[PDB]
Amino acid sequence: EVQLLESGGVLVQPGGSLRLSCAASGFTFSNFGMTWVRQAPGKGLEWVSGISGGGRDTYFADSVKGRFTISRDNSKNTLYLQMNSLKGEDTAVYYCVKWGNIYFDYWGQGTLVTVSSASTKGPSVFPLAPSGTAALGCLVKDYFPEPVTVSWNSGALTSGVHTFPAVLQSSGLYSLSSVVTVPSSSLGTQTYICNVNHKPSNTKVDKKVEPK
Amino acid sequence: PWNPPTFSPALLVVTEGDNATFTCSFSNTSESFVLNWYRMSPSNQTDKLAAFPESRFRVTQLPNGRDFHMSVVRARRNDSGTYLCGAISLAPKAQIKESLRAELRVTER
Amino acid sequence: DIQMTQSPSSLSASVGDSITITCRASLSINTFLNWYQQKPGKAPNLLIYAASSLHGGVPSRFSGSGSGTDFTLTIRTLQPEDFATYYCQQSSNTPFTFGPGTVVDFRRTVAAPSVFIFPPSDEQLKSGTASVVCLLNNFYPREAKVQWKVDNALQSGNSQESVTEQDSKDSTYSLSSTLTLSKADYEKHKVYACEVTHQGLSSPVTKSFNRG
C-alpha cells in the first residue's frame, strides 16, 4: 500500500542548487514524520534530514546544516529537499523514507544526484580482443555522468558475461569494462558485438570485437 | 526535560456495551512524538491497543494538544483490566515515559 | 555523534546455517536500535526495531537482542534470499547514525581465478592514452590482490579495480584491474605484467605480454 517516489536527481555543478521531491501514497501523509537518507556509490547509509508530521520541527546532519532545507506540502502529499551550495561529496542516491516512529519502516527506491564540474559526455568504446576458453570484452571509457547499460549481441550472449561496476577515474569521468568468456572454437565464425547505451548524452554504440 | 504523562481516571467504571474513555495528558515540547495506549495483562505482559497518530480502540487529540481521549467503543466485560499510556519523543533525544496505571471495570448490563 | 560499529564486516555462510552479526554503540542507547537489510541496486528495508521487535512481514528466522551498547542480529536457517548487507542504526539521538554494514555472502568451494591480460587496442592508442586490463574471472572467496609490474618496476597510484557482485548461478566473483598510462609512457616500456594472489592459488600467478 505504501509508496514513496523520489524525483529530481540530475547532474549539477558544485555550489549550485537543486530540489528533490518525493510523492507519498498508501498512508495518511500528514500523520507521519518524514526523512531523507542518502548513500554515496559503494558507501553506506547517511541520515540527511527529518521533518515532523506538521512541518514545525526539522533536523539536519551536521554535514548539510546551513546548506540543505527540508519541507513538505500536505495538500499534495509531497516531501521536498532543497539542496543549496552543493559539494562533490553530496553525490549520492537520495532516499525518501517514512519516519513516524523510532524506526524507518518504508523507503523509496532513491534518486541519483551527481555534483561535479565535468561535462556530460558519451563514452569511448574500445575492444578487449581475445589473443579451450577465450576471454574478450569492451572497455567503456570516459563517460559522464552515470549510468550506462551494456549487453552483448543485443542480449543473445549472457552466459559468462561480467559487466563491472564503473569506477570514477582521476579525470572525473567514469569507466567500466564488460567481458565474457566464449569457446575458442567459435572465434572464427561467431560475431561478438557489445551494445552500449548512455542516455544522458543520447549515445548508442555497437562495437564489434575481433581477434587481433 | 518533561514529566511522564498522566492517565485518568485511576478507576473508570462503565457498563457492558457503552463507551469507556480515559484521558492521557502529555505536555508536548514539539510534534516529534508518538503516544501509545497499552493494556497490561495479569501476567504483566503489555499490548499496544492504539497509537497517536493512528477498530475498537481509538485515540483522539483534544484542541489544547496536551490531552488525548483514549476510548474503548462497545466495551466488553473482558475489556476489564489495567491500562496505561506511554509517550515516546522521537527527536532530538528519543525517550519513553509511561503513565501510572489505571483500571477499567466493565460491569454486566 | 554516536558512532555505530559492526562485527564482522563480512562473513560467508551456507543455506541452513544460523549466523549472528554484532553491532556496538559508542554510548548507551537503551533499546533504540534498528536493523536493516539491503540488496545491491535497491533500497534498504526494516527488519528489527526497538532491538528485538520483528517488523510485520519479515520472516521469523530473523531476531535481535541487546540493550545499552551491544546488540546482535541472528538469522537462523539462513535462506538464499538472506545473502545481503545488514546495517544497524541507532534511533536514540539525532543525528541518527548507521553502522558501516555487514556483508553476508554464500559459502561455496574455493575457486582460483582464471587470469587474463589485455593490451591496449590500437584504436585507443590513436587517442593518446593506453589502458591495460587484467581480468580475474570466477573466483571464491572475494579477497584477492593484484599488483602491476612494467619492465619489473612496481606500479602504484595508476590502477583501479572493480569487482562484480557474487554470481547467482555459480556464486563466484570476478574482478578487473585497469592500468592507465599515457601513450608516450606506454611506448617507452616493453614487458607488462599483472601478478595475482588468491587463496585458491598455491603461488602468486603472473600473466604478462610484450608490447609489439
Cβ C50–A102 below 8 Å, yes or no?
A: yes
d(CA C63, CA C60): 7
Rounded-to-5 percentages of helix, strand, coil across chain A: 10, 50, 40
Cβ C46–A45 below 8 Å, yes or no?
A: no
Alpha-carbon distance B107 to nearest alpha carbon in chain A (angstroms): 35
User: What cell does B3 get?
Assistant: 514529566
**Phi/psi at A148 (5° precision):** -125, 145
Element (DSSP H or E) covering residue A45 = strand A45-51
* 8 Å CB contact between A139 and A125: yes
Mutation for B interface: C2, C32, C49, C89, most B CBs within 10 A: C32
A33 vs C: CB within 8 A? no
C160 CB neighbours in chain A (<8 A) are: 167, 169
* Minimum Cα–Cα distance from B95: chain C residue: C92
* 8 Å CB contact between A38 and A92: yes
This structure's resolution (angstroms)? 2.0
Which of A31, A50, A56 has its CB closest to that of B53?
A31
**In chain A, which residues fall in CATH 2.60.40.10?**
3-115, 124-209
Pairing of strands C10-13, C62-67: unpaired
C32 vs A: CB within 8 A? yes
* 8 Å CB contact between A16 and A86: yes
Looking at domain A3-115, its CATH class is mainly beta
B92 vs A: CB within 8 A? yes
> Within a 10 A sphere around the Cβ of A42, how many other Cβ atoms?
9
User: What cell does A62 get?
Assistant: 551536521
Closest CA to A139 of C158, C28, C122, C115: C122
Return the SS3 of A31. helix
Alpha-carbon distance C51 to nearest alpha carbon in chain B (angstroms): 14
**In which residue are the cell numbers 506540502 written?**
A73
> Within a 10 A sphere around the Cβ of C212, how many other Cβ atoms?
6
d(CA A14, CA A114): 9
d(CA C47, CA C34): 7
Q: What is the DSSP letter of B32?
A: -
Type of residue numbered A66: G
Cβ B32–A102 below 8 Å, yes or no?
A: no
Q: How far is CA C186 from the centre of its chain?
A: 31
Return the SS3 of A120. coil
- For chain B, give every domain's residue range: 1-108
Alpha-carbon distance B92 to nearest alpha carbon in chain C (angstroms): 5
* 8 Å CB contact between B79 and B19: no
Question: What would you report as the CA-atom Rg of chain B, rounded to the nearest whole angstrom?
Answer: 14
Return the SS3 of B33. strand
d(CA B53, CA A32): 7
d(CA B8, CA A171): 68
> Within a 10 A sphere around the Cβ of B88, how many other Cβ atoms?
19
* 8 Å CB contact between C189 and C150: yes
Q: What residues contact residue A172 under an 8 Å CB cut-off, 6+ apart?
A: A116, A117, A118, A144
d(CA A50, CA C12): 36
Which of A32, A59, A101 has its CB closest to that of B92?
A59
How many Cβ pairs within 8 Å bridge chains A and C? 119
Go through the domains of chain C in sequence order and give each one's CATH number: 4-106 (2.60.40.10), 114-210 (2.60.40.10)
- Three-state secondary structure readout of chain C: CCCEEEECCEEEECCCCCEEEEEEECCCCCCCEEEEEECCCCCCEEEEECCCEECCCCCCCEEEEEECCEEEEEECCCCHHHCCEEEEEECCECCCEECCCEEEEECCCCECCEEEEECCCHHHHHCCEEEEEEEEEEEECCCCEEEEEECCEEECCCEEEEECCCCCCCCCEEEEEEEEEEHHHHCCCCEEEEEEECCCCCCCEEEEEECC
Q: To which CATH superfamily is domain A124-209 assigned? A: Immunoglobulins (2.60.40.10)
* Minimum Cα–Cα distance from C159: chain A residue: A169
Type of residue numbered A179: V
The strand order across the sheet containing B6-8 reads B6-8, B20-25, B67-72, B57-61
Q: What residues contact residue A181 under an 8 Å CB cut-off, 6+ apart?
A: A133, A134, A135, A160, C114, C137
Cβ A164–C164 below 8 Å, yes or no?
A: yes
d(CA A129, CA C162): 20
Which of C43, C46, C97 has its CB closest to that of A108?
C43
Closest CA to A210 of C177, C135, C122: C122
C118 CB neighbours in chain A (<8 A) are: 128-129, 131, 137
Span B1-108 CATH architecture: Sandwich (2.60)
